[PDB]
Amino acid sequence: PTVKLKPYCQNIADAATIDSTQYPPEVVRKAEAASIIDDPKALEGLPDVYLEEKTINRKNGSKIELTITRPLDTENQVLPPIVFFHGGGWVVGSKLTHRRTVYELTVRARAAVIFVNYSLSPEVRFPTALEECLDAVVWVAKEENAKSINVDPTKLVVAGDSAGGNLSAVVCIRAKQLGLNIIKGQVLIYPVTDDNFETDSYKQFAENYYLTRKLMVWFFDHYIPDKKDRQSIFACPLKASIDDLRVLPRALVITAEADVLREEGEAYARKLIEAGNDVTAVRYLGIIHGIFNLATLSPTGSEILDHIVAWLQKTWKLEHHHHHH
Amino acid sequence: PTVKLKPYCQNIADAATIDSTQYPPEVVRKAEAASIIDDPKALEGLPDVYLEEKTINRKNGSKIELTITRPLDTENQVLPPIVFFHGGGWVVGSKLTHRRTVYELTVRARAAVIFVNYSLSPEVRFPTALEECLDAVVWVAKEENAKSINVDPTKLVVAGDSAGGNLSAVVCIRAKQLGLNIIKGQVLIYPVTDDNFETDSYKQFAENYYLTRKLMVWFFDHYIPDKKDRQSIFACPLKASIDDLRVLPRALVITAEADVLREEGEAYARKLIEAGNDVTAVRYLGIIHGIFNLATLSPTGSEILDHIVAWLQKTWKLEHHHHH
């Protein structure tokens, strides 16, 4: 069938009219920031949140920067924590590009969203960001830390979009390998899971749908320069064996119909199912990649967030019984 | 890619099956009912609900039996109404086969679910059921009727699975033609939308996925014997023009990955998008058709109901929005 995009996503697809691969990453990031600040709709209907900037200090003196958002009037309430990893191909993206998505998730889920400002590539390479994210989850799951930011570590979930979905997936595999049972759910929004740039979705949507093959290649080349390293399952979790993926957290995998990453996201969901996990995998029709890193939120983006919230609410209900509490 | 079914759906798919197309419909129905009753789990973990049975007297002297379920302690609370059309290929299905699904929707959405026991085929043909379902929606939307069963007609949504998805869709189109503005949303769960038995999903899942191409042909044969009538958009709404499908109610279209009807459901969603409607279309991976007409509810079935409920709540909020 021929893809019929929804109006918003069509608009975005045609709007993308500049090659970021021709510029240095700092320039691209500054242009991105400007495109958010200069969007006249960027602040319209933006929910109000209580925001806190938090630094966690590692052993040697290094820092992980966390941005924590929560609904207003939750000052003495303990909330479920959502540790969020943003997309941007490991090279761009920020609390600003994902402000819309994060503020909406915060007030719809009534959760503390813990946004990890991880180190971007190429200034660092794989696996530095991954280790920062794992360290952030480990920090949040620790009882005294969770008390300090009024969240309930028994409801911790990881969530992320695109390259952030990759990070969510592999942080889960990694925590499993360290014998930790601290992540209760993973939400993967059109994740990067492999480096095969000739899957059918890659062929069909290689150009003119905002996220391009060219851009994916550029991202991978900055993140993992030496191609052999791409064989690590912590880079490309689709290459993992079924046994590698057993006993992972309850998962929601969301894919876009018109997206180069569609096939690998759906194949990763099939592998998670083979491995006996609790997996919900859904493809949304008529949308493209990138609806969650913009100044505004498409109608379908909003439906998707309502879905994610319903699923999170079920996840937390599952926990609450058999009690913790 | 090769389809990976989830365990529950795999087991359902692998099960010992009898060719229903070899038996008369009435026998199929009694056997179906028996299949629900003799399941020891059909009643275990079933939500408790307040149930009321209501008869509609149609203008032509025939009756529609309505089964209305709402949550306990809601006798004197006004609730949103969901008018529900069950699946079964227009030939089978009942308040019993969908009891599990309906009770769960009832307590999860905390809504009044109005289950239409419409007349089955071949005892009647197209379009008798469609006419009954439309009359049921008009009845609920009528203010004194809505007040009598404590529902808020400003939130009326239609919902249906399979052939019941078909009915939901076309009821909307019919209501549009009659200039009625009483449906605020439509939920189409892997709906029948066309009669092309040779789409890609029909070919790929023709056998061994519970719902078969054989069974669909049998269904269409009982529902619409005279093939000329299959050209009606009220039989196959996929055949409607884009202009025909304009300004329909806000829609949620859910398809199953391993299902013969997958392609036409998704094609109908694309047409609804082309026509400028508010449409959410989702394909759930690793499942088959028919998870909503059984004694139990699969894990994915449960997730899907949670999805629908979230979507319904957004629908109900959008409708009440201007009251501010």
Residue numbers in the entry:
A (entry chain A): 3 to 327
B (entry chain B): 3 to 326
Show the paper's wording.
The crystal structures of RmEstA and RmEstB were determined at 2.41 Å and 2.27 Å resolutions, respectively. The monoclinic space group of RmEstB was C121 with four molecules in the asymmetric unit. The four monomers were arranged as two canonical dimers to further form a tetramer via hydrogen bonding network. The substrate-binding pocket of RmEstB extended ∼11 Å from the protein surface to the catalytic residue Ser164. This deep hydrophobic cleft was funnel-shaped and surrounded by four α-helices (α1, α2, α6, and α8) and the loop regions (His88–Gly91 and Ile290–Ala297). The substrate-binding pocket of RmEstB is funnel-shaped with ∼11 Å from the protein surface to the catalytic residue Ser164, a distance that just fits the acyl chains of substrates with carbon chain lengths shorter than C4. Esters with acyl chain lengths longer than C4 therefore hardly bind to the substrate-binding site due to steric hindrance. The structural differences between the substrate-binding pockets of the two esterases suggest that several aromatic residues (Phe222 and Trp92) block the substrate-binding pocket in RmEstB, which might contribute to the restriction in carbon chain lengths of the ester substrates. Phe222 and Trp92 are located in the center of the substrate-binding pocket, close together (4.1 Å). Structural comparison and mutagenesis analysis in the present study indicated that the side chains of residues in the substrate-binding pocket create a steric hindrance, thereby potentially altering substrate specificity in the esterases; moreover, residue Phe222 played a vital role in RmEstB’s variation in substrate specificity.
